[PDB]
């Protein structure tokens, strides 16, 4: 009772407008209490539940006035340094036995690191799971409250992207439980539609596992359908989207026809036995859902307009190349010699020039695995393309940690003593080029400014050496005692030519080294480590360096609804008789009404996207297959009663089909689409009906009268 | 807003175990394709939910579900000025909400549930939208809450909860005598109206000048 009417007052307060002029020390204080009431199963369970709702409110009045303060900063470069574990809950101590200012911003991050402590899977052994689906819940609700609005604040986007992402696939890969896989799927569902276009990376990789374990227990299978059922529904046109921006692109990997082919794998009957009866009604949900908006974008243009698009654009014809650029990966890794003289003669390279190859190692991500990139640069004599390459980079005001950090990234050095020394003179000549010349500039009391030390190049190798080294010894863990600060000090005592270094940069170089692993491409032989390899190198490209675009919206704004309509071309000529397939084969095999006439509807709309589109075999094969369901195509003759047309009035599967396909063949505008084997079957239908007495044989009676027979 | 609608319309069908569900699937065929709130009838977007807190039938892990919805659906704050007829809908939750029932069950207790209802009675009571409702309805709501905090049967905590809920409720009330002036003037006011008319109404929830 006294626990409870704690929690009263204090959200009380905080709902209260006085609770806006509390501070973050306390208010981070109050958060862990009522988190350490809700998660706790000691107290009554009823106790629990008013800690669960209250916390809702609190997480709402908190994320609300995210919308009222302003961005900070100038929207410069974010180098993520703060570790993902500095914040942790604290045990329940109620019961029988920049913070102190106002408050604001800055006590969202601790909140969120709360959270992903929670939520994170090194945790696992200590919370349990009921804290667990609350805190993805938590995450959900402030999420969903001000998504839009995160796009902002990088110190926010970097946890919310990385580590909370990073724990979503683990529960969806490893879990078990069918409650928790519910809130996680729930949480990526809402992460996919409200930060879709700013999070592009994470989905690819979190849909080809999500495909990999729905396709080869059975009750996941279910659930894992349901709840990414809605990206189909409530999006907008979801397919078309994750075509336009990742499929037809090069570097990232297949996810639209990926997800065709495995709704349409999925959708057959035959799937009714490895999965249980409820996924094949949405999986074909979303496969009508397909066709009906794209016939929704039909109805606009017309026939003669589209076939004006003379360039044939640009972006299909490199995805036409993209299955000869998954060959050039595999040729260079195996080989660096070799291989660039095929990569140049297929012309994927504007040149053969250092700037140009240079350009492509720099903007290529996911293939050309980057250890063999690493070996290239190495080479005993191409210092040329290695200091153009270096050169490339920026490191406009950036930190030495941050520059390296930068670096690392993108590719392993190698491994030898004598290997390693070439990178170092080109990064430090680009970091010399990259700042500005220093004359009464530095001074050793100042702070809080990268410009005001301009370290000499053979110093900024020193740098580098030492805090490789230091990064090398400090995080191995079977390895003990670290050097610390008053011996990594004693090291480097003159550097700066004949002139000492200042404290502020070395003590905010050993932070930020404390803070958090440099990252580095990392592969091993056979499994260990897989996911976690996998995911560092996934997220090494991107997280470690953001800056704030634009044009936040997609560009499906900019194309015109013609360029749509073009670019869907890539989406049928890989995808239609795998759906018409599908289609023909659940439709003969289902019996029931309203299922058989959305499917009639649905291939009817398909037919006319194959009218439009100038696809003669699809186009063909459809309604052949129609005709072969007519049930017109190979008892005495006596209101005509006959054995054809008892078999046409007892059947409504062949009753219904007649009728679309008269009025497919009505709706037509173009007659060279028709083919020999559709003539013929239309003409043997027009024989069979004038067989049984059935079609009246007069339907030109002015010829008759004229010629007056 | 609609994203909010069709993804708690999957949970609570799924939590079902694949009459009722034709509401809810009826719903979600409605806005599978309708992009912002339009001309909707909103008192129907809310109606399918109110049909589970209301039957008696229902097990108590699922109203649970949907008390839990409702919280959720005031939380965000997608019924607003803008969508039409949101006095009716905001009335008819309160007016479920009142008769709620369920039978007993070993998943979660009686409490959860009979809690969540007490602090969405609460939400809606102190909120704006508490200022457009009825005296019938908010008299059944005042019964509702007297017989929660007078019945010694529940436990404690529930008590304390009802209680400070109640005094809350009670600041709601009598603050709204500031802004509206008193009836007549300088009548000769005669008193006849009764000392008893009103009782206490006895407990019906858990397991087992009006209208303006």
């Not at chain 1, 650029?325 to 070799?338: G, H, Q, V």
């Not at chain 2, 919805?69 to 965000?76: A, E, N, V």
């Amino acid at each position: 009772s006294v626990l409870l009417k704690v929690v009263f007052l204090l959200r009380s307060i905080v709902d209260s407008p006085y609770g806006d002029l509390l501070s973050n020390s306390i208010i981070y204080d109050v958060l862990q209490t009522i988190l350490s009431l809700a998660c706790n199963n000691r107290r009554s369970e009823v106790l629990r539940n008013a800690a669960q709702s209250t916390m809702i409110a609190v997480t709402v009045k908190i994320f609300s006035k995210l919308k009222t303060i302003e961005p900070v900063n100038v929207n410069q470069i974010y180098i993520n340094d703060e570790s993902y574990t500095n914040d942790v809950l604290k045990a329940d101590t109620i019961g029988t036995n920049y913070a102190d200012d106002n408050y604001g911003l800055p006590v969202v991050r601790q909140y969120l690191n709360l959270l992903l402590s929670l939520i994170a899977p090194e945790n696992e052994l200590k919370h349990s799971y009921s804290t667990r689906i609350f805190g993805l819940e938590l995450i959900q609700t402030a999420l969903e409250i001000s998504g839009d609005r995160l796009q902002l604040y990088p110190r926010l986007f970097t946890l919310i992207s990385d580590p909370i992402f990073k724990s979503i696939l683990f529960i969806i890969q490893n879990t078990t439980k069918l409650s928790l896989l519910q809130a996680t799927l729930q949480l990526f569902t809402t992460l996919v539609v409200i930060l879709g276009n700013n999070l592009q990376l994470q989905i690819e990789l979190t849909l080809t596992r999500i495909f990999s374990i729905l396709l080869d227990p059975s009750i996941i299978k279910e659930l894992l359908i349901e709840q990414i059922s809605i990206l189909w529904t409530r999006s907008p046109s979801f397919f078309t989207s994750t075509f336009i921006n990742f499929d037809c692109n090069l570097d990232r990997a297949d996810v639209s026809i990926n997800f065709l082919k495995a709704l349409t794998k999925l959708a057959l009957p035959e799937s009714a036995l490895t999965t249980t009866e409820s996924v094949p009604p949405i999986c074909l949900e979303g496969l009508v859902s397909l066709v009906d908006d794209m016939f929704d974008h039909m109805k606009d243009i017309d026939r003669e307009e589209f076939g004006r698009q003379k360039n044939e654009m640009e972006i299909l014809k490199k995805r036409d190349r993209k299955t000869e650029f998954i060959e050039c990966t595999n040729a260079f890794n195996e080989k660096p010699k070799k291989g660039i003289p095929m990569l140049i003669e297929k012309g994927f390279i504007a040149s053969d020039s250092d700037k140009d190859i240079a350009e492509f190692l720099f903007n290529n991500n996911n293939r050309m695995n980057k250890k063999t990139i690493g070996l290239l640069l190495c080479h005993p004599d191409k210092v040329s393309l290695l200091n153009e390459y270096i050169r490339l980079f920026d490191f406009s005001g950036l930190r030495v940690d941050e520059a390296i950090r930068i670096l690392l990234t993108k590719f392993r050095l190698p491994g030898e003593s004598q290997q390693i020394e070439r990178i170092i003179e080109a990064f430090s000549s680009a970091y010399c080029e990259n700042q500005d010349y220093d004359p009464s500039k530095i001074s050793d009391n100042a702070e809080d400014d990268i410009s005001t030390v301009q370290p000499d190049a053979d110093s900024v190798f020193i740098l580098s050496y030492s805090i490789i080294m230091l990064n090398t010894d400090l995080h191995n863990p079977q390895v003990k005692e670290h050097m610390s600060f008053e011996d990594y000090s004693g090291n480097l005592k003159g550097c700066c030519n004949h002139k000492d270094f200042p404290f502020w940069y070395l003590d905010r170089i050993y932070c930020s080294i404390r803070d958090k692993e440099i990252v580095m491409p990392e592969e091993h032989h056979g499994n260990e480590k897989w996911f976690e390899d996998a995911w560092n190198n996934l997220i090494s490209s991107t997280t470690v360096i953001t800056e704030i675009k634009k044009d936040t919206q997609s560009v499906m704004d900019k194309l015109t609804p013609l360029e749509l309509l073009n670019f869907d071309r890539a989406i049928f000529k890989q995808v239609g008789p795998s759906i018409v397939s599908t289609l023909f084969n659940i439709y003969v095999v289902a019996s029931d009404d309203h299922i058989s006439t959305r499917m009639i509807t649905s291939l009817d709309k398909c037919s006319y996207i194959s009218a439009f589109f100038d696809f003669k075999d699809l186009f063909n094969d459809i309604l052949n297959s129609i005709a072969k369901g007519t049930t017109l195509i190979n008892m005495p003759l006596v209101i005509p009663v006959s054995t054809d047309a008892v078999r046409f009035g007892r059947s409504f599967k062949g009753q219904l089909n007649t009728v679309v396909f008269f009025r497919i063949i009505r709706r037509n505008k173009d007659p060279k689409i028709f083919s020999k084997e559709l003539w013929l079957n239309i003409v043997n239908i027009i024989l069979t009906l004038y067989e049984d007495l059935i079609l009246s044989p007069d339907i030109f009676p002015d010829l008759q009268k004229r010629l007056k027979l | 807003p609609v994203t909010i609608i069709i993804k708690e319309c999957i949970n609570l069908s799924t939590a079902m175990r694949k009459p009722f569900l034709s509401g809810f699937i009826q719903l979600r065929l409605m806005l599978n394709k309708l992009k912002n709130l339009d001309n909707i009838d909103s008192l129907t977007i809310l109606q399918p939910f109110l049909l589970i807190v209301s039957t008696s039938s229902i097990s108590g892990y699922i109203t649970s579900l949907a008390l839990d919805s409702l919280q959720k659906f005031f939380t965000l704050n997608i019924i607003n000025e803008s969508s039409q007829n949101y006095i009716g809908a905001h009335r008819a939750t309160v007016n479920a909400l009142t008769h709620c029932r369920f039978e007993g069950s070993q998943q979660l207790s009686d409490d959860s549930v009979l809690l969540k209802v007490v602090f969405l009675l609460r939400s809606i009571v102190d909120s704006p939208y508490g200022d457009l409702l009825s005296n019938s309805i908010i008299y059944d709501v005042l019964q509702t809450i007297l017989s929660l905090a007078c019945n010694n049967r529940r436990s404690e905590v529930l008590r304390n909860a009802a209680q400070s809920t109640m005094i809350a409720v009670t600041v709601k009330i009598f603050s709204k005598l500031k802004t509206i002036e008193p009836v007549n003037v300088n009548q000769i006011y005669i008193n006849d109206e009764s000392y008893t008319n009103d009782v206490l109404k006895a407990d019906t929830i858990g397991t087992n000048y009006a209208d303006d």
